[PDB]
Structure formats: C-alpha cells, structure tokens
Amino acid sequence: KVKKITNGTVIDHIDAGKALMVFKVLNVPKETSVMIAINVPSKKKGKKDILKIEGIELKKEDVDKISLISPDVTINIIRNGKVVEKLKPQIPDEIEGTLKCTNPNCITNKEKVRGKFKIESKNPLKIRCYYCEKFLNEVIFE
Amino acid sequence: KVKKITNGTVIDHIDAGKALMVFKVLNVPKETSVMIAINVPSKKKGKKDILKIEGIELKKEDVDKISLISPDVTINIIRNGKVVEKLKPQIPDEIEGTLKCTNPNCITNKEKVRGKFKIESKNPLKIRCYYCEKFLNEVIF
Numbered sequence: 001k002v003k004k005i006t007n008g009t010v011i012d013h014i015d016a017g018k019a020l021m022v023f024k025v026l027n028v029p030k031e032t033s034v035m036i037a038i039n040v041p042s043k044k045k046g047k048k049d050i051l052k053i054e055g056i057e058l059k060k061e062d063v064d065k066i067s068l069i070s071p072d073v074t075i076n077i078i079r080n081g082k083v084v085e086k087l088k089p090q091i092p093d094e095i096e097g098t099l100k101c102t103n104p105n106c107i108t109n110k111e112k113v114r115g116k117f118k119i120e121s122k123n124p125l126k127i128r129c130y131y132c133e134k135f136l137n138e139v140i141f142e
Numbered sequence: 143k144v145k146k147i148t149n150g151t152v153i154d155h156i157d158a159g160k161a162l163m164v165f166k167v168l169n170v171p172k173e174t175s176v177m178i179a180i181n182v183p184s185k186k187k188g189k190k191d192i193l194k195i196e197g198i199e200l201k202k203e204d205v206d207k208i209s210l211i212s213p214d215v216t217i218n219i220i221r222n223g224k225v226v227e228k229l230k231p232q233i234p235d236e237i238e239g240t241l242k243c244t245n246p247n248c249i250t251n252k253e254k255v256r257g258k259f260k261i262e263s264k265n266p267l268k269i270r271c272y273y274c275e276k277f278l279n280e281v282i283f
C-alpha cells in the first residue's frame with residue numbers, strides 16, 4: 001500500500017502524541033523524507049506514535065535524547081528494507097546544554113553559563129541542574 | 143499494508159516540507175489519529191507532503207487557510223474508506239490579520255497593529271502587506 005523504507009530508521013512505540021516532539025528534537029535536514037503516524041493502534045500500548053526516517057541512521061546523542069521524551073521506544077535500523085537491528089534509547093547520566101533549567105533565577109538563565117545537568121533517577125526520571133541543584137519540573141529542549 | 147482512513151480527510155498535494163505547518167494551523171484535538179507523509183514522491187509535483195486525518199472533515203475556514211500555505215492542495219473527503227469528494231481551495235483577495243508580515247521593520251511587528259494583506263496574485267501566490275508594501279516571504283499565522 002505504501003513505499004517501504006529501503007535505508008533509514010523506524011522509531012517505533014513512541015508514546016501516543018509525542019512523535020512531533022521527538023521529530024522536532026531530532027531536527028533532521030529539511031529535505032528528509034519522513035512518515036509520521038500519530039495515535040495509531042498498538043497491541044502493546046493500545047495507541048502509539050511512529051516516526052519513519054529515510055536515509056538517516058541516528059547518532060547516539062540523538063538516540064539518547066529520545067529517552068528524555070518517550071522512555072520505551074524501539075529504534076529499528078533499516079537496511080535493504082529489512083530491520084537489521086533493534087536498539088533502546090539510553091537515559092544519559094549527565095547532559096551538556098540541551099535542556100533549559102526550570103529555575104528562573106538559576107545563573108544559567110540570568111548569565112551566559114551553558115546548562116549542565118545530572119540524571120539522579122531513571123524511573124521516574126529526575127534531572128537535577130548542576131548549578132542551582134534544583135530538579136527540573138519539566139523537560140524542555142532549548 | 144497500512145491502515146487506511148475510514149472516515150476523515152486526506153489533504154494531498156501539500157508543498158514539500160509544509161505538512162507540519164498545515165497540521166499546526168488546523169489545531170486538531172489531541173487524540174486525533176493522523177498520518178503525515180513528508181517529502182514523498184509525486185508525479186504532479188516531483189516531491190510533496192500528504193496529511194491524512196481520521197474522524198475530521200475540515201471546515202471551509204480551514205480549507206481556505208491551507209491554500210495560503212500550499213495553493214495546490216487537494217482536499218479529499220473520505221467516507222466508508224472512499225474518497226467521496228475532491229475539493230479545491232478558494233484563495234481570498236484580502237486578508238485581515240491572520241498572517242504575520244515577514245518584514246521585521248513593518249509597523250505591525252513593532253507596535254500592536256492589526257495586519258492587513260492584499261492578494262495581488264494567486265498563481266504564483268503573492269501577498270502584499272498594506273502597511274509596508276512588502277510581499278510575504280512565507281505564510282505565517
């Protein structure tokens with residue numbers, strides 16, 4: 001019924017309604033061919049989102065960023081139209097820049113100091129700002 | 143192969159890379175099931191985007207908004223899994239506010255002034271701001 005990917009990545013089992021957030025964070029080149037399924041059937045999740053990206057094999061850094069958005073996705077490496085590998089995003093121990101400290105008065109939001117964070121818990125996800133040492137109350141990609 | 147739309151809308155022939163902007167302006171309910179194809183083959187346009195929405199038949203207002211973003215779209219109404227009607231957008235001659243002038247120096251972008259544009263050409267689409275007289279370099283709501 002539709003053009004099957006030859007070479008690329010299929011980010012499957014994304015929590016329903018979060019594919020657009022994931023896609024934005026990945027920030028792929030403008031001419032990239034992509035298929036985005038939102039709120040579609042899932043035997044495992046009931047409903048889910050899917051991101052199919054042609055011609056790109058995500059780098060570790062991008063892969064792991066996804067873990068901060070949807071903790072149970074399956075990264076499917078496609079080659080010759082076949083799934084040759086399934087990866088799970090890793091929640092990093094530390095993060096450079098990337099996120100916004102949710103403390104309005106943090107030195108990183110008042111001065112020119114790049115963000116720095118540390119993950120202190122994976123489930124639930126708890127991220128502490130290195131500088132003000134306050135936990136983020138939300139995950140925000142800068 | 144993939145699940146088809148049973149009842150809803152298939153917005154076809156969207157200019158490549160513009161489906162997300164179109165989807166954003168439609169602002170559909172959070173639980174809406176959707177399929178977005180970006181930069182896919184098209185005999186008619188070489189490359190294009192396609193937006194498929196289950197459970198929603200776009201209202202005229204939305205239809206005409208889409209055209210400003212992508213003038214050659216085809217609105218396909220789906221019922222019982224079949225395209226029962228093929229709609230073409232109507233491009234207005236004038237526009238009140240709605241769009242943001244793409245000229246940073248325009249008064250509308252420095253003071254709180256209600257935008258106003260004139261469509262001087264639909265093929266190709268040329269939208270002129272009444273205040274600064276400059277043509278939009280992009281359709282922004």
Ligand SMILES: Nc1ncnc2c1ncn2[C@@H]1O[C@H](COP(=O)(O)OP(=O)(O)OP(=O)(O)O)[C@@H](O)[C@H]1O
Binds near residue numbers: 004080
């Ligand atoms: N070449 C391809 N082009 C586009 N989509 C593909 C391709 N290969 C498989 N997929 C997608 O990758 C995902 C996983 O494929 P498979 O690994 O075939 O699913 P499962 O359903 O067998 O995997 P899970 O058991 O879901 O990991 C599915 O969502 C599938 O539609």
Ligand SMILES: Nc1ncnc2c1ncn2[C@@H]1O[C@H](COP(=O)(O)OP(=O)(O)OP(=O)(O)O)[C@@H](O)[C@H]1O
Binds near residue numbers: 002043045143
């Ligand atoms: N390119 C696509 N366009 C439209 N719908 C799609 C596309 N690819 C996958 N789907 C739909 O996504 C749903 C899940 O397919 P898969 O992901 O194939 O189910 P599973 O049952 O393999 O998923 P679980 O592994 O159950 O999440 C199906 O309804 C399928 O038709």
Ligand SMILES: Nc1ncnc2c1ncn2[C@@H]1O[C@H](COP(=O)(O)OP(=O)(O)OP(=O)(O)O)[C@@H](O)[C@H]1O
Binds near residue numbers: 145146192223224
């Ligand atoms: N029930 C459906 N579910 C999902 N997609 C559909 C469904 N019916 C048809 N479409 C899509 O709607 C668009 C128009 O269908 P048709 O009108 O069948 O295509 P054409 O290619 O025959 O139309 P054009 O000649 O492209 O207007 C196509 O992109 C088609 O794949």
Ligand SMILES: Nc1ncnc2c1ncn2[C@@H]1O[C@H](COP(=O)(O)OP(=O)(O)OP(=O)(O)O)[C@@H](O)[C@H]1O
Binds near residue numbers: 003035155187
């Ligand atoms: N849900 C989908 N998932 C992935 N790819 C899709 C999906 N629906 C359609 N496509 C792709 O969109 C492209 C155009 O299909 P159609 O829209 O069927 O072509 P046309 O030749 O009918 O288009 P024109 O009418 O030529 O734009 C094809 O490559 C098709 O496989």
Ligand SMILES: [Zn+2]
């Ligand atoms: Zn599956």
Ligand SMILES: [Zn+2]
Binds near residue numbers: 106132133
């Ligand atoms: Zn801080």
Ligand SMILES: [Zn+2]
């Ligand atoms: Zn067609």
Ligand SMILES: [Zn+2]
Binds near residue numbers: 271
């Ligand atoms: Zn202006």
